[PDB]
Every structure is written in C-alpha cells, then in structure tokens.
C-alpha cells in the first residue's frame, strides 16, 4: 500500500481564512477573505504537489506550470470533501472560520457557482466516495490541465499521468468498470466548475480597485498571468469522456 501511504501522509491539514466573523457579510469582506484563503492554501498546494510520488520527474518549469493551472480545481475538490464531511453539504466549508450559508452565498455574488460547488460536494455522498478514492482522484486533478502546445517535457507528464490513472484503477480494484466510469465522470465535472471560478476570479481582479476587494501577491500574479491562458484557450483541461 505504498502509494496510499504517501498520499495520506502528505495530505494538508486545516487552513484558516483569517476572516473576522463579527463584521457584516459584505461582498468586499467575503471576497477578500476568500482571496486570502486562496493565498494561504496555495502555500500548502505547492508543498503537497512537490511531495507527490514521481512529481520531481517533471521538468522544473512543468512543475510550477502544472500547479499554477490546476490549483482552482484542486482547491474546489478539496473544499467539496470538507463540506461533505463537516456540514454535509447545504453549506460550503471553505475554512473553519469561513463557512458559507445561503446569505453569504448571495452577498458574495457567487450564488450560482456556490450551488454548483454544493452539488459537487453532495456527489461525495451520493457516490459513497472513500477517503482513498478521494485522495487518488485529487492527485489526478493535478495532472488534468496543460497547455495546448504541450509542456517542456510532455513525455514525462504523459507517463506520470498514466501512472496516476493506474493507481486510481488499483484503488477501485481493491462493478469495477461501473465504479471507474463513475469516478472519471466525477473528475470531469470539476473542470466546468473551476472554469466558472477562473472567470469570476479574473473579472474581479480587473475591477478590484473599485469594489474594494484586496488580492494577495501570488493570487494577483496567477490570476493575471496564468488564468488568462485558460480563459483564452491556450491551456485546456484533459477530459476522460
Ligand atoms: C479557491 C477558493 C479558496 C479556497 C477554497 O476552499 C475554494 C475557493 C473557491 C473560490 C475561489 C477561492 C479563492 C479566491 C477566489 C479565486 C475569488 O477571487 C473568486 C473565487 C474564489
């Protein structure tokens, strides 16, 4: 069980957003705390990804690119799991100090995206996703979005992605065919959600000075340098189906 030993050992712990929960639920306050949470989670996503089996086989530039394209999906998938295990998924458990109820979903001006994130969260229950299946699926999501012109060493990426798909198939095997279809459909469903959030993030960065929404340093860098490559079609998700 070497592969799952590693995935369990490197899984990040709790990350707080730093939100002041006794101020009013304003658009600016909620979105600023979400941006701060993103900046804080990015630290952990980088350390997690660098410790994955085989990740250092990738060329160093492909290592940062793959993190910088897939962070949205990774973070939404993990938040869906937190919500499913914590508030059972009529709320969104972004962080222990940033839990969205319906009021916050409206004041954030993200209600429709939050609905879709809630549906993602509920699928962990409907499909009875095990912790091992969650861990393998999440690792795969790191290897599920790349430039259309390819990475600096695409061949090493294709081998690594192959091997993570094989590990997912092994966890299922330890009926099988139905399960694999269900899980790969679930993985595919993350990308349209992440794309809606990529669009929201970009639009909000552009008009941030006017809606009093603060963007941390690495969030502002990634949203203005990398996210527009996704929105303009230069970087695309790899779908199973
Ligand atoms: C990844 C984050 C923060 C981490 C998390 O749990 C999921 C959540 C999804 C919405 C993102 C948010 C970071 C800040 C963003 C990108 C806002 O700018 C717009 C949508 C927000």
Swiss-Prot record:
Effect on the protein upon substituting residue 88 to T: In PAIS; 50% reduction in transactivation
Name of the featured protein: Androgen receptor
Effect listed in the UniProt record for changing residue 188 to N: In AIS; loss of androgen binding
Lineage of producing organism: Eukaryota, Metazoa, Chordata, Craniata, Vertebrata
Disease: Androgen insensitivity syndrome: An X-linked recessive form of pseudohermaphroditism due end-organ resistance to androgen. Affected males have female external genitalia, female breast development, blind vagina, absent uterus and female adnexa, and abdominal or inguinal testes, despite a normal 46,XY karyotype.
Species of origin: Homo sapiens
Region annotated Interaction with LPXN, chain positions: 1-241
Outcome after substituting residue 144 to N: In AIS and PAIS
Gene name, Swiss-Prot/TrEMBL: AR
Notes concerning its domains: Composed of three domains: a modulating N-terminal domain, a DNA-binding domain and a C-terminal ligand-binding domain. In the presence of bound steroid the ligand-binding domain interacts with the N-terminal modulating domain, and thereby activates AR transcription factor activity. Agonist binding is required for dimerization and binding to target DNA. The transcription factor activity of the complex formed by ligand-activated AR and DNA is modulated by interactions with coactivator and corepressor proteins.
Cystine residue pairs: none
